[PDB]
């Protein structure tokens with residue numbers, strides 16, 4: 001089997017991407033944030049505290065003839081941005097782009113933090129990291145991809161995120177028309193439960209390439225590119241008027257400035273992030289200060305190749321016995 005679904009930016013800045021997912025019988029379609037940095041499929045639901053729901057579409061398990069309570073199961077998760085959610089668990093039928101998993105753990109939110117409430121466009125998350133990170137207790141549950149894997153034509157999924165435009169998640173096949181050149185594959189460590197890999201270096205604009213190992217994670221659920229402070233300083237030093245603002249919480253720049261591209265290495269191959277991808281607009285309405293899309297990972301404890309980086313590439317998440325990551329230009 002295979003599946004193929006369109007993923008759409010939630011706003012004009014590509015702050016996140018939502019993908020429609022069918023849950024239950026008859027189908028309840030929710031727009032979920034596909035997150036290769038986590039491993040829980042959780043949804044706004046009829047069980048979510050009423051005051052914490054504000055425009056989201058909810059899953060109502062009592063209206064699904066295939067829903068079954070996973071008795072005694074609870075879940076609770078926190079994300080890198082300080083957001084969180086928790087609740088209980090049902091198993092149900094879940095379909096993505098024509099690909100169906102029966103008995104998928106669907107984690108129903110009883111509580112969500114304010115950032116989730118305040119984002120009306122995201123109805124939940126669909127985690128695509130390794131199932132070892134899944135938070136369900138007492139019995140850890142498998143991700144949608146892990147459940148589908150054995151049925152798939154090939155044990156892979158791909159992320160093809162758009163810049164200010166829709167893109168595609170495919171399951172079970174590699175669309176050879178979706179990228180240019182070749183796909184370069186690179187080793188993955190699953191020891192932290194992430195799609196963790198090592199970039200071979202970087203360049204800023206037309207500058208020479210710096211060969212240096214940068215260990216990080218391929219994370220579709222993180223908006224920006226977070227790299228070591230040295231690398232980030234070297235980037236913004238090439239932007240007239242750019243500065244790191246502690247009050248804003250990162251690098252900002254006057255949008256009268258022209259942003260250079262940023263290149264990162266995948267083995268001997270190179271992915272070029274165009275400068276425009278690094279502009280996240282005014283820090284507040286009407287401000288002449290813009291927020292940068294490349295920021296320091298210092299104090300995160302890990303480098304994160306988030307959407308800013310991934311949307312410059314066609315990315316293969318290869319779930320073979322020894323997982324690997326593939327990157328192509330597009």
Ligand SMILES: O=C(Nc1ccc(Cl)cn1)C(=O)N1CCCC1
Nearest residue numbers: 035037079080081082221222300
């Ligand atoms: O928290 C996240 N990323 C993130 C955000 C900020 C920083 Cl410094 C680091 N990481 C994240 O992956 N998600 C997915 C759902 C909404 C939040």
